[PDB]
C-alpha cells in the first residue's frame, strides 16, 4: 500500500492489527502491553494530557523494547479508530484521540507492515 512514508505507514498497521487484536488503546493498557513482551511497537502523539507520560513512555521503551515513533496531531490517529470496527472513520457520534497506541508484533506479519518498521529500525 504505502511507500514507507511515516503517515501512511501507521495506517497500514491498524488495518490488519485490528484482525490480530493487537491494539492496546489508552495509556494504562499501552503500559501493561509494553510491560509485557506481547508488544513490539509504540507510537505516541501530541500532548493533550500531562507531561508525565511523554517521559514515561520513553522510559518503558528503554528498559524493555525500543520501538518508539512520535507523530503529532492526535486527531489523525483518533480518526483512524472506529467505535467497534470498520463502518465510518468520519463519525460525529464519537471520535476522540488515542494519544498513544501499542500494537503486538505490529499486527499481522505479512506484506508492507514488515517493511515500514524494518525501514525505521535500522536508521534509529
Amino acid at each position: 500500500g504505502g511507500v514507507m512514508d511515516v503517515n501512511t505507514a501507521l495506517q497500514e498497521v491498524l488495518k490488519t492489527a485490528l484482525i490480530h487484536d493487537g491494539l492496546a488503546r489508552g495509556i494504562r493498557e499501552a503500559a501493561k502491553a509494553l510491560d509485557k513482551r506481547q508488544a513490539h511497537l509504540c507510537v505516541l502523539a501530541s500532548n493533550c494530557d500531562e507531561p508525565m507520560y511523554v517521559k514515561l513512555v520513553e522510559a518503558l521503551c528503554a528498559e524493555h523494547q525500543i520501538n518508539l515513533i512520535k507523530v503529532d496531531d492526535n486527531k489523525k490517529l483518533g480518526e483512524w479508530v472506529g467505535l467497534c470496527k470498520i463502518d465510518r472513520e468520519g463519525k460525529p457520534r464519537k471520535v476522540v484521540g488515542c494519544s498513544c497506541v501499542v500494537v503486538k508484533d505490529y499486527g499481522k506479519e505479512s506484506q508492507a507492515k514488515d517493511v515500514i518498521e524494518e525501514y525505521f529500525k535500522c536508521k534509529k
Binding site: 495509556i27 494504562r28 508525565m52 514515561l56 528503554a62
Partner: protein, 71 residues
C-alpha cells in the same frame, strides 16, 4: 398488587469515584522506571498489573476471592 409506599433511604449503585489515572509509575530519570509496590505474583495474573498499596491490607484486585496478604 397495589402501588409501592414511600421509603426514606433508597440509593442504588455507587458512582465508583472519579480518581486521576496513571501515576503508578514514577519517573525521576530515564531510562529508569521507578516502580513502587510489587506487581502481582500469580500464574493466572499477568504480573503487568500493580498490587494495592493499601497498608495493613495488601490485595490484588484482579483476584476476587484469593491472595490477600495483610502485613
Amino acid at each position: 398488587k397495589k402501588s409501592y409506599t414511600t421509603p426514606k433511604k433508597n440509593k442504588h449503585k455507587r458512582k465508583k469515584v472519579k480518581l486521576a489515572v496513571l501515576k503508578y509509575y514514577k519517573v525521576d530519570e530515564n531510562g529508569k522506571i521507578s516502580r513502587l509496590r510489587r506487581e502481582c505474583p500469580s500464574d493466572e495474573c499477568g504480573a503487568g498489573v500493580f498490587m494495592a498499596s493499601h497498608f495493613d491490607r495488601h490485595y490484588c484486585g484482579k483476584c476476587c476471592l484469593t491472595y490477600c496478604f495483610n502485613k
